[PDB]
């Protein structure tokens, strides 16, 4: 293991007049009131090249570049008179205007990660004093700033290529070595970023200084220098196409749980056993008269747009990391995804769209009394959500084998193709529904089990 470093230096409580911003407003504006939300701009954005990479996080859209790139000169080539170490303390203070916006944005609920189910943001708190989201600032915000320093194909919002060509010109102007350059473009990103990654051995010393003055200068959490551990994070994930994918997944799952709570408040609360509403009747079956509609049609729209974002985030992630799945990447990195089935909620199937208008919450949004109908007398068999034709050519696979609470693994059993495509889609929405009001769960479970088996 390594150690921490000096100093108590950087007493720049008022660093300088930073022209960038005092508040990172990508999830609306600070309370009072909201508005000013930045969004995950989709693929094929010209300002980010061909945008072959993943979509653009809103926080990275309003990333606090501070005074490395800045404005008041239209789009200023800001590093020609300004510096880079103001960003050292505006990683510190841009995450002090954002650890006072941790403390307000993240720790009062004007961020997405900010708000949990109902208790809020202080009942949930990691060991390092911080409401959840600063562990995702050293990881999200800090790594994204280091990414801005390095940059993938998706150039961020000010043609970061101009700043990188400046790094070639205006930062390779005798930094770090003399004008006798070392290496070239290969070993540019690791000479002016190996005495900026070799002093991100010291910018990680400087970001552990950042956290230790998040402890000693603005004291929302007081301990030694340890942001997420005294070491920089693992490689192969700091890739913007991966870290941004993880950010997108966490944000999506948090706000999906949010909409789940809202539809609880409209179909668990304000709702009934069939999740209907005031005078829901036929009519068009027992469809919602509206009380759920405007509380769940918003969920349908949200899933539509987030699917439009995820469909081709996932494709890029897979083809870049062939052999790993997007759900695999997301689910264990954020414990709030454990109830999310990105396959089910994002099925590319018109029958799925029709039969599950409200995604995995269809059974807890619009209920027509799920009921297995026997062999005769107006069989309702195809009239429910359906099943693929069985694929003949699948290969025996050892993925998704359970892991024993022994901690062991089965290590040798292979799932038959007949079983790994066993069709149990119907069962999932019912399972999601029957979290509540038990002893009806079994009643609906037997019916949906019959229809699945049939």
């Amino acid at each position, epitope marked *: 293991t390594n150690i921490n470093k000096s100093e108590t230096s950087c007493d720049l409580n008022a660093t300088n007049y930073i022209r960038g911003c005092q508040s990172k407003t990508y999830d609306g504006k600070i309370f009072p009131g909201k508005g000013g939300e930045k969004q995950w701009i989709c693929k094929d954005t010209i300002i980010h090249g061909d945008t072959n990479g993943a979509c653009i996080p809103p926080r990275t859209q309003n990333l606090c570049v501070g005074e490395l790139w800045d404005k008041s000169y239209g789009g200023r080539s800001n590093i020609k008179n300004d510096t880079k170490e103001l960003l050292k303390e505006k990683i510190k203070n841009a995450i002090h205007k954002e650890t006072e916006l941790l403390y307000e944005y993240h720790d009062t609920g004007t961020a997405i990660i900010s708000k949990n189910d109902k208790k809020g943001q202080k009942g949930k708190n990691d060991p390092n004093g911080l409401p959840k989201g600063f562990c995702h600032a050293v990881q999200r915000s800090f790594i994204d700033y280091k990414n801005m320093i390095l940059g993938t194909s998706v150039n961020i919002y000010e043609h970061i290529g101009k700043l990188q060509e400046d790094i070639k010109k205006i930062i390779e102007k005798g930094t770090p070595q003399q004008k006798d350059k070392i290496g070239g473009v290969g070993s540019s990103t690791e000479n002016v970023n190996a005495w900026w990654k070799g002093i991100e051995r010291e910018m990680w010393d400087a970001v552990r200084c950042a956290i230790t003055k998040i402890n000693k200068k603005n004291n929302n959490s007081i301990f030694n220098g340890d942001e997420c551990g005294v070491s920089p994070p693992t490689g192969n994930d700091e890739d913007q196409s991966v870290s941004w994918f993880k950010e997108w997944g966490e944000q999506f799952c948090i706000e999906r749980l949010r909409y789940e709570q809202n539809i609880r408040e409209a179909c668990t609360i304000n709702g009934k056993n069939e999740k209907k509403c005031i005078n829901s009747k036929s009519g068009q079956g027992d469809k919602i008269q509206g009380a759920c509609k405007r509380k769940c049609e918003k969920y349908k729209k949200y899933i539509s747009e987030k699917k439009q974002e995820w469909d081709k985030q996932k494709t890029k992630y897979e083809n870049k990391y062939v052999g790993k799945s997007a759900s695999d990447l997301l689910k264990e990195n954020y414990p709030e995804c454990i109830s999310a089935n990105f396959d089910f909620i994002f099925n590319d199937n018109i029958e799925y769209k029709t039969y599950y208008p409200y995604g995995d919450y269809s059974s807890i949004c619009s209920c027509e009394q799920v009921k297995y109908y026997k062999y005769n007398n107006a069989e309702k068999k195809n009239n429910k959500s359906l099943c693929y034709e069985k694929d003949n050519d699948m290969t025996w696979s050892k993925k998704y084998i359970k892991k024993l*609470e*022994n*901690g*062991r693994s089965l290590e040798g059993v292979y799932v038959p193709p007949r079983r790994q495509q066993l069709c149990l889609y119907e069962l999932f929405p019912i399972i999601i529904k029957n979290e509540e009001g038990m002893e009806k769960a079994k009643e609906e479970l037997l019916e949906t089990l019959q229809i699945v088996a049939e």
Partner: antibody
Amino acid sequence: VRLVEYGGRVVRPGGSLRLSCAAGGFDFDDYGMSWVRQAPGKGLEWVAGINWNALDKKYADSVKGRFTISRDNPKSSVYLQMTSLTAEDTALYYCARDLRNSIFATGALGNWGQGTLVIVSS
Amino acid sequence: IQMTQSPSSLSASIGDRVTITCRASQDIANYLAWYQQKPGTVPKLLIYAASTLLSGVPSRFSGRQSGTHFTLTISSLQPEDVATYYCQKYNNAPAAFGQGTRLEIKR
């Protein structure tokens, strides 16, 4: 042949704490494990016991529901998660192994660890 | 399940025979082990199966059983045998230890 515990700490009353126990040349895969606590200047007291495959977990009547035991054989560790700690649970906690590989949680504790103090106070 | 161990403070002198009793309320037929603990150390298992002396233990120890009365006998008490003895039963559920008998030198 070598058991060491981690997690001994001073915790607020009603808090939580996770003790861990390693294993040495010991083949920590088919031996049951147990946790035994000794309050300062008192007699030993069995606390928890876990089977070889962790399909059988037994707890002392006093520490029940408040205590959870678990294994992780590839990591070769056994953990005790403790919650709602009272002022009376202040004790030196030992992790011990059966001296006989078997299919039961409880057995004769042949090898013991050095133990960790779990002083509980405000 | 309780394990009543008595006496609690048995005294003796070097060369004496020392007997410790560990009455068990229920039937454990022979799933009982004896533990010796000197001050400030980990316990050491002396006897298991209520009679089977563990290897390396001095042969002056012995353990016998009558129904649910288990007795540990030190034939020739030695100055390095002054400790507490615990008689933990391990048949099934609570595997509870005994109260603990503390030997002392009689002067």
